[PDB]
Every structure is written in structure tokens, then in C-alpha cells.
Design a protein around this nucleic acid. Structure first.
Ligand SMILES: [Mg+2]
Ligand SMILES: [Mg+2]
Ligand SMILES: [Mg+2]
Ligand SMILES: [Mg+2]
Ligand SMILES: [Mg+2]
Ligand SMILES: [Mg+2]
Ligand SMILES: [Mg+2]
Ligand SMILES: [Mg+2]
Ligand SMILES: [Mg+2]
Ligand SMILES: [Mg+2]
Ligand SMILES: [Mg+2]
Lengths: 109, 176, 148, 199, 50, 138, 135
RNA sequence: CGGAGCCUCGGUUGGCCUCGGAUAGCCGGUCCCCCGCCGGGGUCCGGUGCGGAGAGCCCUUCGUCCCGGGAAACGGGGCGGCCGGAAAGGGGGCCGCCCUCUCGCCCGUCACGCACCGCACGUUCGUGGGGAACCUGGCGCUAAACCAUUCGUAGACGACC
RNA sequence: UGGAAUGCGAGUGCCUAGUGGGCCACUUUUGGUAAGCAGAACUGGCGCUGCGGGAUGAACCGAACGCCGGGUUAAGGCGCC
């Protein structure tokens, strides 16, 4: 067993300077620091994974405190490897600067 | 005119529109250094207007075409005669450049005239461009490359890949 | 917009930003284009531009409505009396400025183009100044590809 | 986990900008030898800049700020604080992810220090330009522990030299060992050379 | 406007705040700088104002 | 202190640009920033090249400044620069890099096994050598 | 993804296990085998979008896969609960596992160290980024 | 100091245990020569687009079984002591032990394990932090602070002596 | 051969509120040393109007507004905030 996802940081939301578009998240991925290295990740699944107080069901498992908001990478962002991600619900602002998981599927290689 | 990108040399031929008095007006030609042809034709009408009782309405462009460099793979010294307006007058200058294409030497002129004199390209009128032999050059910066046994190192080679890696364990080396 | 420019832009039917129209050139129309020079980018379109414009963004003005030209019958019913009965006849009348350019062209609704993909240089100055306004001759085609 | 940086030979502002962004993205950063930091411009004009800063004080109660920290670590810390949204919870949390030190106290003395080539003076300054030392600057605006930091930094370097000599001793043995077992590891060495891990 | 006639301010701002001391027994804020060449000796003492 | 010089015939390694990874010879110097380089035997047309993208090697061909491509190729063959380059430690390190960059997932697994065993044999020997030197002191 | 290609499974209980591709079924799902004796993955269906195809291949050109191994063969059989109900490996499945494995396995062992590769599991580690490495 | 659990808080999903530094110069050997309390200088030899490379290194995990081949044998795992650490101090190495294994590593032979019938929150750090309790063994401890009273070196009251 | 181009459906009648302090900018312009001063012409603005940029701002630059998703832009920008 071992890790099967790439380490990403929830950098912030899509924004100008004084307007915030919370439906899109800007993700920084480890080792991706050019716009041309982001092509592998486009369309990949993203998962903000966290813990809460009340137990919740787990697919293929028994209830625990883990929770996840799913999303996927939609496009690159800027010249330095950032990608825009969209989630089934807008990410909470408390998650900025914290881990976002980037999966290896849907695989295109 | 905005000296956008590398300029090109254009050969522009125009004339007065034929009239009953003169059924065949004489033809005039100009060497135009411009970004594209649409600009090239515009500057032609600006120059011939200054020299002749002519303008776009009472004349036509007979030929606009790019003049290609004849020896793009050979080093040459260029002499450029130009006049420009400063904040407080008009001046004539003679400048020299070392390049492979005459249009490259002219592009160097605009970037250089902007750097050393804050001259925007709308104030610069390139009068003449000639290829000059090494014996006839006047500028010490150009003449020092007329040396058959030229040699020199590259001291203090600055690191240009300064964010790959952004954080590193070893300090860079400037000697090579 | 100054009163004279505003009237000339309505006569060209460019009542909205990034609206497009064909104009057949002559002393009457070239002098109108000079008045609205700061407000327009224009040039000479090639055959491919006329094709892609009318195919992707071609809408007829039928009964004062904007109808997508999804069928040849739409052209034939309105312009058939001038023997324009298919998209190719409509493209031919526009491109060659046929005898019925006026009718075939006014039949087309002003083309609603998108913002130029890749940006502009400077909308506030002429093309020859490194901007966008005025006559850029055949360079209009590069703009049309990025907006069509 | 924690990005440890060496403050020696780095330009104050450039390092802070990179360090400020790292802690906003959630990374823990430790900067050591803040007295080794450099500032472009001659020393005197940099001293004047801080003496002007010292004049800024609430005329009616100087105890109410601004507070003029004299340690090179705190001067750098306040510089990084100037590149953060430090009046929001997000900015203060980022500011808590940075630790700043004069010299190299434990446990960072026995850990590898990274540099930031984009903030290195040798990379960013023409060699003819003058520059200032944050340590000399700080010492001359009221910092009181320049001599002690140097005295303790002199003891650490003597210990580091002993450690290095031991590392060189162990590498000399390693190269000798690779020669003694050259026959027993030949097959495994071709695998590495085949795939570039050994040139 | 400027005050008509000059005069020194009353009191020294270097002794602020003018508050009750936190310590009843006077604290030695600075001992003499040690000189390693002198013989071992003490540098302070306590007495009572008779 | 300087050992390598921008001079006519100097062979440089192109590090970045359209021709990155190739060898060219300095045919002439245009100005402080550009040279006229030629790569007849390495598939580079005669052209202007900034000194920034170059890296001087130790080879120096002999031909007159601005000599046309026939004689630049001629000198390249005489000095056999292509084999001399590939025999340098500089060239070998480039090859070692791209072998490792193109390693397959299975190849990565085989290296881990070979590395794992080689690292154990060496470490065991180093322990014995450490013990050996201890007795000499004792 | 060509027959005999080694795929890395990304999801399910078998995630990270390297398996052997056999063929694509009529529904577009892939047929793979562990083989069961190397990584404990049986004749199993998997989705192509949820695997990473490596560059390592074996020639199973001469392997005869049974024609009754179809989508309907692998489709789950519903189990009714009124306690639970447990899936039971049918005897036909075990027979089919040996039929296919007995041919593929010798071909695996021809390639040196390949069997050990199929026993190992894929994982991402420090400094290893998927976009950089060839599979 | 040496058991089950129950609440609650979160984040995380291998480790790098270190010369000093120069940058118009560096790094490693060589000690054969000169100095010093094994280290410094010189000479000599090697590397220098750093390969004694952070563009790096270390670790690498499916488990077990049978029997072979390489590698170990100076070996792995497990209770007593001595050097060593203070800027914000080491669950490192080493000497003994009575023990405990020839399995750990690499390549093979031989089969097995819920093979849960395509699918998410998997995979550590984790005997994590904090809180109540319940045990269950051993070795240990039996204080102060504030009020009240008194003082007047203090004092609007508090405070202070 | 509805006799230039272009565009556009027009004509017409009753009843009618509020307003009748304005102010700002390019150009032109009177008085004044000048004024964020007083007085004019033209157009456009603010007033009545949000929105992106000019850190901040009635008027500047861009652009005008039903409630949304995706894409692209303007004027402006891209060390960090
Ligand atoms: Mg784009
Ligand atoms: Mg304007
Ligand atoms: Mg003080
Ligand atoms: Mg006075
Ligand atoms: Mg967890
Ligand atoms: Mg006024
Ligand atoms: Mg009002
Ligand atoms: Mg209005
Ligand atoms: Mg408005
Ligand atoms: Mg401003
Ligand atoms: Mg939008």
C-alpha cells in the first residue's frame, strides 16, 4: 500500500482583486510549476477530505468521521502550473492553504 | 508608427494620379522600415507629402513589397542617418550598428534611440541606411569587433533559471 | 458618442459593440467610414472570411425577426426574386458585390461577433499607430478569425 | 515538513516575498542567520532608512506604536509581515508558520539549510553595486547581541567542521568499499549505469 | 501660535511613569562590568537607613 | 583564471532555445551579445545566437572567421568533434540524465532492487573497514 | 492498452496492483488477471479509465482464453437479505482461473524479475510526480 | 513508573542527522615537504555546466510456504555500563549480557490466503492532543494561597510593607 | 429604368406631471496675478448610475445593469499584500 494521489494546495478562489467567484478553486499542485506541465492533470478528480464530529457512512466501509467534497480539474490557470478546479459544493474558506487530493483517474495515459 | 517587433524593409512605389495635364506622372520610390505593409504605405504618404505636393487622395501606391536581406548570413556594419525631435529641438544623427539584416540594424536603432534619448518612433525619421566597410566606421563600440583574432570570456555568468528549483541545497556558481 | 458618429454607426447598423457588417465601398461610404474611424475596425475580407462569417453567424432578417439560416428555403423565399436561393448564392452576391448586394446584405442581420480571442493591441488608437481602429486592409481577416 | 532557509547572502525584500507566499500556502518556514541578510544600496543610505523609521512614533504616546524592533530576526519578521494580510485570521495564521532566528540555534543547527537562488545577492545584484549587512545595520540601531551571536556562531562552526571531517572520512571509506566489493556488486552497477543512476 | 516667552518644561520625562515601584527593595539594574584581572570580590550590599 | 574564450572556432553547447542540446561552432562575433554560429555536422543552420543560450566547451576548431559552411564542416570532421564530445564526462552526464528520465515503471522497480542489494553489500564492507581502522589505533 | 500489457489498477480493493490485460469485453470493460498466484487478483473486469497502462508487455498472442468469459459471466448475481448473504467462488471460476493462468504464468516468468514486479504495489512517494515519469 | 475502552479536537498520508564559504573562482584526494594542538600551507593528481550532482541521496510494504543459488558469518533481534549534549542541552554511536535466530537482503523453484463477482472517505504520522471516568500493580508526598487580625517604611478604596 | 449611397414603417390629435438653484471634462473663449474664481460656445458627462481599472474619490479610463452556467475580452495589470 501507499499514496495514490498527488498533493495539491487550495490556494484560493477565482477572483479579480475585489470580486470573488467561489464556484471555482485555484489549486497548486506539487512539482507542477509551468503551464505546460498541467496537461496531465486536466480532468483529473479532486477531493477535499476532512473530518467532522458526527459519524457518516463510508462507501464500502462502516461509518466514521471522514468526509469529502469531490471535484475535478477543469483547466490550467496562469503560467506557473496552477489549475482551476470545480467541486460539487463550493469549498469552505477554512480550507485555504490545506491539502487537496488529486487522483490519478480518469486515466488518459 | 510604433516600432513593434522586428521591423521590415519595404519598397513602396507611388505616384500622382494621372490627369489630362500629365497623362503619365513620374514614379517615386521610398525605403520604408515598418512593422507591416499597412503601416509601410501609411508612412510613405507621410514622407512624400513632406517632399511633394502629393497625398493619399491625389495619388496611388503602385507597388508595396518587402525587400529581403541579400546576405542574411554575413556580418555587416550599418551606418544610419536619421533626424529626430527631442523635447526642445530637432537633430541629425549618424549611428552605426553591427547586424546581419538591414532591417535588424534599423530595429536596433529605434530601441537604441528610445533608450539613450527617450525618442518615440513617431519623432524619428530615418533618412538613409548604408552598409559600411570596417575601415569606414566611426563609432568605437562598433570598431572593436573588427579584430580577426577576437577573443573574450564570459565572466560572472548570472543564473537565469532562478525558480527551477526555487529552493535548493547548494548555492549557484557564476564561474564557467 | 458624439451625435454625428452616433448617427453614422446606426446607418451602418453597428448599434452594439463587436457587431459586424459588410459595406460596399464607394465615395459615399468610404467618407462615412472616416467619420466613425475611432469607433470601428474595418478592412477587406477574403473569400474564406465571407464563408465562415455567413455560415457560423449568418442570420436572416425575415419578417423583422432574427432567423438562423439553417435552411436554404429561408434564403429562397426572401431573396429568390433576385435569384438568390441558396447560401452559395448569398455568399456569391456578398463577395462579388453583385447587382443586388444591397438587398442580400441588408437581409443579413448584423453579425454578432465575440470578443477577440487573444485580446487587442489598443482600441483607442489607429491600426497604423499600433492600435485597432481604422482601416487595416486585409489584416481584418486575422481579426475575423479570432472573433468569428 | 518545515522549510529551513539560510539567511546569509539573501536580499531582505526578495526573501520576504518568497517566504511570505510560502507561509500563505500553508508551509512551515524557518529562517536562520537573519543577521546574514543583505540589503541593496550602500550601508549609510540603508542606515538612514531605518533612522527615519525610528522617527515614526505616536506623538501623543510613543508606547502605542509603531514598535521598532532592533534584532535582524525581528526586522526580517516585520518585513515578511508587511507582505501578508496580517489583520485577517488567514494572514495571522500564515505569520505563525514562520520562525526567525539570529544565528542557528538548535534544532536547526544540525539540519540542512536550503537557499533561495531568486533572493541570493550573488544572483540579483551586479557585483559593483554596494550593499548593507542586516547585522551591522541592526547593531547600529540598538541591537545588543551582535557580539554574543558571533561568539556562539563561532562555536557552532567549529563543531560543524568536525562533523564534516567525519563525513569526509566516511565517504573515503565508501569509495574504498566500492573498490573492495567491485566484483560482488558489478552486476548491480550495470543496472544503475544502464538506467542513468550512475554515469 | 508660538508661546510668547520660552521656558524649560517641568520635570523629566526620563523618569516616567511616575508610579508606585513594584519592588520595595531596590533592584540593581546594572552591575559593574567584570574585569577578569581583578581579585574575586563582591559588588553590592544591603543596609538600612538609620 | 578564465580558460574558455568566445573565439572563432570555439565549440559551444546550446542549452536552451530551439536548438537546445546541440553543438555549434562560433564562426564570427556580431556584437557583445550575439555570435554567428554554425552546426553543419549537428543540424544547425548558420545563424545568429545569443551568448546567453550557449556554453563554451573545450574544443577549438581552426578556420578563418566568417569562413563559409564548407570549411566549418571540413574542420569539424578533421577534429571528429562528434566522437570527442560523446567521450567527454559532460556528454556522458547528459546521457545519464535522459536514461533516467525515460525510465519505465518496470525499470524503476529493477533499479530499486539492484540499488537495494548494492547498497547493502557496500554498507557491510564499510562496517568491516571501520572495524579495521579501529584495531590499528588500538 | 494492447493484450498482454501490464496495467496498474487505481480503484477498488485491488488498487495499486499490477495486472495483465487479456482482452476487452463486448461492453468495453477490460478483462484482466492477476494472475491470482502473484497478486491475488483473479479473472476480473475493470474499466479502462481507471487504470494506468505501463510500457511493459508480454506476448500472450498464443494464449487461448475461453469464449464463455463474457460480460454476462462476470456480472454480479444479486443476493437477497430478509441475515446477510456471502459471495461464494463457484467451482467453474476456479477451473477457469487455472486454465488461463497455466498459460500466462510461464510467459510471465520468461521475463526476468517480472513476477516480482507483479507482486509489488504502485505508490507515489516523496518527489515523485505522475506527470514526470514514464509508465 | 507499569489495560480495555468512551468523548472531544483536528490536521497529515516516507526520511534526509548539519563544513565553512567563494562567485574575475570552486570541490575532492595526495601528506612525499614545511608548520601545530590527527588539523593548516605548499607541491602533485583528479573533477568543475557542480555526478563526492538537492537535476541529488537514503527507505521502499502484499504475507506466508517447500527447496536451490548468490550475499552474511567481523551477521540480525532482545538487558546492564562508559565518553558525549547548555543558544531553546541527545529514545545517537560504542563496551559487556545469559539470551534469541540462522528468516530477514537479491535471483529462482513450489503453492496457498475472502478471488467479496468494474467503482468513493483506501494507504501512515497513531499507543496523536485534550477531558472525564473505570480499573489493575509497584515506588513516593503529606502544602500553600487569599480573607480575617496586626503594621505604617504604604495608602482615596484596592494595593503595598 | 419611382431617376445618388446608406439605414429606417410613418403620420396625426387630445390630456398631461415634474422641472424652470445646476455642476464637471476635451477643444474654443471673456474678466482676473491667479483661484477647487466669475462668465460663455460645442459635444459628452455627473445630477438620475450601478459595474471593471485609476490604492482612496460625483465627473477620469473602460463599460452602462433582468436571475444564472461556460467561454473571451476592454481599460488596466501579473515580486508579496
Ligand atoms: Mg485564453
Ligand atoms: Mg477618449
Ligand atoms: Mg531603548
Ligand atoms: Mg519661540
Ligand atoms: Mg486520516
Ligand atoms: Mg465655471
Ligand atoms: Mg436635484
Ligand atoms: Mg440620462
Ligand atoms: Mg455612469
Ligand atoms: Mg492615484
Ligand atoms: Mg462570466
Amino acid at each position: 500500500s501507499g499514496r495514490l494521489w498527488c498533493k495539491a494546495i487550495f490556494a484560493g478562489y477565482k477572483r479579480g482583486l475585489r470580486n470573488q467567484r467561489e464556484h471555482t478553486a485555484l489549486l497548486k499542485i506539487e512539482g507542477v510549476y509551468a503551464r505546460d506541465e498541467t496537461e496531465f492533470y486536466l480532468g483529473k478528480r479532486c477531493a477535499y477530505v476532512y473530518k467532522a464530529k458526527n459519524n457518516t457512512v463510508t462507501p464500502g466501509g462502516k461509518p466514521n468521521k471522514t468526509r469529502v467534497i469531490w471535484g475535478k480539474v477543469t483547466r490550467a490557470h496562469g503560467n506557473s502550473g496552477m489549475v482551476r478546479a470545480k467541486f460539487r459544493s463550493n469549498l469552505p474558506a477554512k480550507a485555504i492553504g490545506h491539502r487537496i487530493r488529486v487522483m490519478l483517474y480518469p486515466s488518459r495515459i | 508608427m510604433k516600432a513593434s517587433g522586428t521591423l521590415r524593409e519595404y519598397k513602396v512605389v507611388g505616384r500622382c494620379l494621372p490627369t489630362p495635364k500629365c497623362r503619365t506622372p513620374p514614379l517615386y520610390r521610398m525605403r520604408i522600415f515598418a512593422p507591416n505593409h499597412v503601416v509601410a504605405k501609411s508612412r510613405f504618404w507621410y514622407f512624400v507629402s513632406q517632399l511633394k505636393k502629393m497625398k493619399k487622395s491625389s495619388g496611388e501606391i503602385v507597388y508595396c513589397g518587402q525587400v529581403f536581406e541579400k546576405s542574411p548570413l554575413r556580418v555587416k556594419n550599418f551606418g544610419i542617418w536619421l533626424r529626430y525631435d527631442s523635447r526642445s529641438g530637432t537633430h541629425n544623427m549618424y549611428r552605426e550598428y553591427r547586424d546581419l539584416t538591414t532591417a535588424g540594424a534599423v530595429t536596433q536603432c529605434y530601441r537604441d534611440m528610445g533608450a539613450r534619448h527617450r525618442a518615440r518612433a513617431h519623432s524619428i525619421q530615418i533618412m538613409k541606411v548604408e552598409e559600411i566597410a570596417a575601415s569606414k566606421c566611426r563609432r568605437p563600440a562598433v570598431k572593436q569587433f573588427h579584430d580577426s583574432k577576437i577573443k573574450f570570456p564570459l565572466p560572472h555568468r548570472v543564473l537565469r533559471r532562478q525558480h527551477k528549483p526555487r529552493f535548493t541545497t547548494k548555492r549557484p556558481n557564476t564561474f564557467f | 458618442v458624439s451625435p454625428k458618429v452616433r448617427k453614422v454607426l446606426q446607418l451602418l447598423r453597428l448599434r452594439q459593440i463587436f457587431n459586424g457588417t459588410f459595406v460596399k465601398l464607394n465615395k459615399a461610404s468610404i467618407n462615412m467610414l472616416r467619420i466613425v474611424e475611432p469607433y470601428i475596425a474595418w478592412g477587406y475580407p477574403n473569400l474564406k472570411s465571407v464563408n465562415e462569417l455567413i455560415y457560423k453567424r449568418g442570420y436572416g432578417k425575415i419578417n423583422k425577426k432574427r432567423i438562423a439560416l439553417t435552411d436554404n428555403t429561408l434564403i429562397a423565399r426572401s431573396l429568390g426574386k433576385y435569384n438568390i436561393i441558396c447560401m452559395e448564392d448569398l455568399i456569391h452576391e456578398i463577395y462579388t458585390v453583385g447587382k443586388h448586394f444591397k438587398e442580400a446584405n441588408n437581409f443579413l442581420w448584423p453579425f454578432k461577433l465575440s470578443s477577440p480571442r487573444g485580446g487587442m493591441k489598443k482600441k483607442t488608437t489607429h491600426f497604423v499607430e499600433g492600435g485597432d481602429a481604422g482601416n487595416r486592409e486585409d489584416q481584418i481577416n486575422r481579426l475575423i478569425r479570432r472573433m468569428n | 515538513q518545515v522549510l529551513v532557509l539560510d539567511g546569509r547572502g539573501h536580499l531582505l525584500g526578495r526573501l520576504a516575498a518568497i517566504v511570505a507566499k510560502q507561509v500563505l500556502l500553508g508551509r512551515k518556514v524557518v529562517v536562520v542567520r537573519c543577521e546574514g541578510i543583505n540589503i541593496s544600496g550602500n550601508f549609510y543610505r540603508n542606515k538612514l532608512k531605518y533612522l527615519a523609521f525610528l522617527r515614526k512614533r505616536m506623538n501623543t504616546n510613543p508606547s502605542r506604536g509603531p514598535y521598532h524592533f532592533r534584532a535582524p530576526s525581528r526586522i526580517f519578521w516585520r518585513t515578511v509581515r508587511g507582505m501578508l494580510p496580517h489583520k485577517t485570521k488567514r494572514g495571522q495564521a500564515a505569520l505563525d508558520r514562520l520562525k526567525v532566528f539570529d544565528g542557528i540555534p538548535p534544532p536547526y543547527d544540525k539540519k540542512k539549510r536550503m537557499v533561495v537562488p531568486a533572493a541570493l545577492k550573488v544572483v540579483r545584484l551586479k557585483p559593483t553595486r554596494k550593499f548593507a549587512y542586516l547585522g551591522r545595520l541592526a547593531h547600529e540601531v540598538g541591537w545588543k547581541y551582535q557580539a554574543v551571536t558571533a561568539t556562539l556562531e563561532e562555536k557552532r562552526k567549529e563543531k560543524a567542521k568536525i562533523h564534516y571531517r567525519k563525513k569526509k572520512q566516511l565517504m573515503r571509506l565508501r569509495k574504498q568499499a566500492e573498490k573492495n566489493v567491485e566484483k560482488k556488486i558489478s552486476k548491480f552497477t550495470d543496472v544503475l549505469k544502464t538506467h542513468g543512476l550512475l554515469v | 501660535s508660538h508661546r510668547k516667552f520660552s521656558a524649560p518644561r517641568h520635570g523629566s520625562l526620563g523618569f516616567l511613569p511616575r508610579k508606585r515601584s513594584s519592588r520595595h527593595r531596590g533592584k540593581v539594574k546594572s552591575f559593574p562590568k567584570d574585569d577578569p584581572s581583578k581579585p574575586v570580590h563582591l559588588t553590592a550590599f544591603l543596609g538600612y537607613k538609620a | 583564471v578564465f580558460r574558455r574564450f568566445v573565439e572563432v572556432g570555439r565549440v559551444a553547447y546550446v542549452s536552451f532555445g530551439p536548438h537546445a542540446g546541440k553543438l555549434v561552432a562560433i564562426v564570427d562575433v556580431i556584437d557583445q551579445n550575439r555570435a554567428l554560429v554554425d552546426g553543419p555536422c549537428t543540424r544547425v543552420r548558420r545563424q545568429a545566437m545569443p551568448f546567453k543560450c550557449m556554453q563554451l566547451t573545450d574544443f577549438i576548431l581552426k578556420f578563418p572567421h566568417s569562413a563559409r559552411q564548407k570549411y566549418v564542416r571540413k574542420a569539424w570532421e578533421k577534429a571528429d568533434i562528434n566522437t570527442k564530445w560523446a567521450a567527454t564526462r559532460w556528454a556522458k552526464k547528459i546521457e545519464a540524465r535522459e536514461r533516467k528520465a525515460k525510465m519505465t515503471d518496470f525499470d524503476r522497480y529493477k533499479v530499486m532492487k539492484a540499488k537495494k542489494m548494492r547498497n547493502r553489500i557496500i554498507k557491510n564492507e564499510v562496517k568491516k573497514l571501520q572495524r579495521a581502522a579501529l584495531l590499528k589505533a588500538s | 492498452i494492447t493484450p498482454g500489457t501490464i496495467l496498474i489498477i487505481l480503484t477498488g480493493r485491488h488498487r495499486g496492483k499490477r495486472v495483465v490485460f487479456l482482452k476487452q469485453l463486448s461492453s468495453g470493460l477490460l478483462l484482466v488477471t492477476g494472475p491470482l498466484s502473484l497478486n491475488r487478483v483473479p479473472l476480473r473486469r475493470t474499466h479502462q479509465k481507471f487504470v494506468i497502462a505501463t510500457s511493459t508487455k508480454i506476448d500472450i498472442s498464443g494464449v487461448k482464453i475461453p469464449k464463455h468469459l463474457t460480460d454476462a459471466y462476470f456480472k454480479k448475481k444479486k443476493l437477497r437479505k430478509p441475515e446477510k448473504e456471502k459471495y461464494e467462488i463457484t467451482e467453474q471460476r476456479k477451473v477457469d482461473q487455472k486454465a488461463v493462468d497455466s498459460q500466462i504464468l510461464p510467459k510471465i516468468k520468461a521475463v526476468p524479475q517480472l513476477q516480482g514486479y507483479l507482486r509489488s504495489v504502485f505508490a507515489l512517494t516523496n518527489g515523485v510526480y505522475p506527470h514526470k515519469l514514464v509508465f
